[model samples]
Target: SSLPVPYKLPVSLSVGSCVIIKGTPIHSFINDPQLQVDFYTDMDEDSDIAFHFRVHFGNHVVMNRREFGIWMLEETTDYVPFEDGKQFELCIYVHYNEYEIKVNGIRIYGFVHRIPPSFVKMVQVSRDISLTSVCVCN
Candidate 1:
């Protein structure tokens, strides 16, 4: 994660795959800090995204999918359970039916895939945080 924001890494996946990330906001939550993680079908930012997870530190979390350059229906929850000025762990699990997401060990969502998970060739992390560590498990 120390590599930088907007970091992109190619990866492979199976049903039990997981992505664990530890990061801290560069600005206070009062500033509504934000961060995003994307599971992409290609290495470029403009490529189709299988999962687009965005968090507004002080407000909520939103998720979406992009296929053929079109944004799909969005999914969001009005919950922000992270502390300001502290690092937070985000873990995403790949399941047969959907991608399960957790923040600080709290289950947040099961975003069903619009495209199969096997199509995700890269994972990208970006926005207002300093990432400290990132791990991907298959």
Candidate 2:
């Protein structure tokens, strides 16, 4: 069994803040498991999500935003380097213009801000991975 799903943590994110998620995916062939990280406008699940980053095994990394309960067009890239059942350190650095995303300390993608970075209040991580730690640093 996996450790847990949907770990929600309150975060105070600014332009200089960095979010880090450390975890491992379970070794399973269940429908192409994924790991998701979201920066929300609030704690509510239905609230607007400023950044939604998802990594699908053997596929690609998808990034998007949700406004008014509707998902916007997704940005897909094949820069994700994930190994099944392996440990990983995912980092998202908040910049004035965008969010700089990195996997295992390597830069992967940058998601430009549609909303102000200071508006983000919570971070939620879910799906098939097991989380060891979550940290927010200013």
Candidate 3:
């Protein structure tokens, strides 16, 4: 896709909505690369986020929410299913109660909603990864 990294797309979600991000790390795992995706309440960088998913390549994943510019409790996992220097397809499915996250095509983690999905007006993909494609669709 022609979209740039640190991309931000305005969105509105409902149950069954999914955000698909296809990308490759700019550096190998040993370089400590990271990728981050956030569902924001607004298009502004300082806006609150409904969901925040961050990957610390070859290490762990961190998940959380941010409101009023304050980050909430973070949740993390050491299971990094991605390869050292390869591409990955990360998907976020909007379910009834939570955002079901997946790596490639496998289920991974879930972050329960703290705000209505409709409140999420934007999605941001940032950090040390190169964009291949990003889509939000049913």
Candidate 4:
């Protein structure tokens, strides 16, 4: 992987389409899975963060919706079958004001947003995984 961030974009998730992020992390093991895919704004530590979430191997996805510079896990979904050392794609959607995330085109969760989708200014993907490309227009 060249960098944690895609040279172009992380995703521009459409209302009906899924945001597919393709990648291989720096540290992904078949058994020692420690990969986490994150959607975030203000990736730079110095910048003020807006909203962010992390999806880890074994199917656990969580997000920390920022409140006045404080971040707390607002939602989480467990029991995913993500494995390491393989190309994986994570799909995220926005429908009816809900943020739905899917892995490998399989619907995993739909998170109702407290704020509007317009509030999401930026998106990012990171963690133990290495990314090849990220397509939000998918």
Candidate 5:
């Protein structure tokens, strides 16, 4: 089945807002499957990214920031618990100074803000996973 990919939508991401994504990987038989969630300053495809969270199945969970079309230093976490074809929950909680990322109720990473997160007006999701739901809450 073809699943919707690259889910992009408008949002008002303030200090207390949170973005939650629920989904499962495409399938085990596939190769190099991954998922990404990004918060952007605008709808422009080239807008600066406030936070970038990517999970590579069987590889690593990576985090980084992109400003003015340049990628900042890349950071990787070795823990990847999402299984192929299994459902997972990813949450990004916005804070004054950083973003707290949690996978399946476990806080795995916190990314310091390089740009004011309230400037984020859109959220985008892309890659090899089937999105069950995506929501933004305060």
Candidate 6:
């Protein structure tokens, strides 16, 4: 499958480092919006994924293990109120144990790598956002 035709950037993840998306989205215009973390293959294309959904205001994040293609919640952050027009840096680190996330430079959540981390060759940010910088680890 192909990724949604829209303005998106490529983020490559690596161990010992993370991809950080820095910017403030126009949240005031968004209603009940959630953050979405997408693990993708080639840019502009959809590949087999690990995590691909909205992280709604809640205690945890959602992840999909490759065993049967079902989504589950594993880790909790209790993060709430996806604010609008607030500058934040969202990070995703590809680690052996899990895919760690840091929001606004604070460690918020981590989802275990259902498929091999190597399977995640690219990362794309979505869901009511205006990104400033999406940095990737080599």
TM-scores for all candidates?
0.96, 0.92, 0.96, 0.73, 0.92, 0.70
The segments of candidate 2 whose C-alpha lies over 4 angstroms from its true place after superposition are 1-3, 28-31
Clashing pairs in 1: none
Over 18-134, each residue of candidate 4 has an lDDT whose tens digit, in order, gives: 566777655555444454443444344433333455666655766656655577557777856566667777767767577777777778777676555544445656557667776
- Point out the worst 10-residue segment of candidate 6 by lDDT: 1-10
Q: What would the per-residue lDDT of candidate 3 be over residues 1-138, giving only the tens digit for each residue? A: 356889999999999999999999999888899999999999898999999999999899999999888999999988779988788999999999999998988887888998888889999999999999999989
RMSD of each: 1.0, 1.9, 1.1, 3.3, 1.8, 4.7
Identify the runs in model 4 with alpha carbons over 4 angstroms from their true place: 2-14, 30-51
Q: Write the per-residue lDDT of candidate 1 for residues 65-119, one digit (tens) a residue.
A: 9988999999999876888999999999999989999899999889997778988
Local distance difference test scores for all models = 0.90, 0.88, 0.91, 0.58, 0.86, 0.59
Model 4 RMSD in angstroms: 3.3
How well does model 4 score by local distance difference test? 0.58
Tell me the number of clashing residue pairs for each predicted model: 0, 0, 0, 6, 0, 1
lDDT of 5 by residue, 60-135 (tens): 8999989889999999998876766788889899999999988889888889999999999988989888888988
| Residue 6 displacement in candidate 3 (angstroms) | 0.7
Q: Kindly report which residue stretches of model 1 are placed more than 4 angstroms away from their true locations once superposed.
A: none
* lDDT (Cα, 0-100) at 38 in candidate 4: 39
Error of 1 at 30 (Å): 1.0
lDDT for model 2, please: 0.88
Query: Given candidate 3, what's the lDDT at residue 115?
Result: 86
Clashing pairs in 2: none
Among all windows of 10 consecutive residues in model 5, the one with the lowest summed lDDT is 1-10
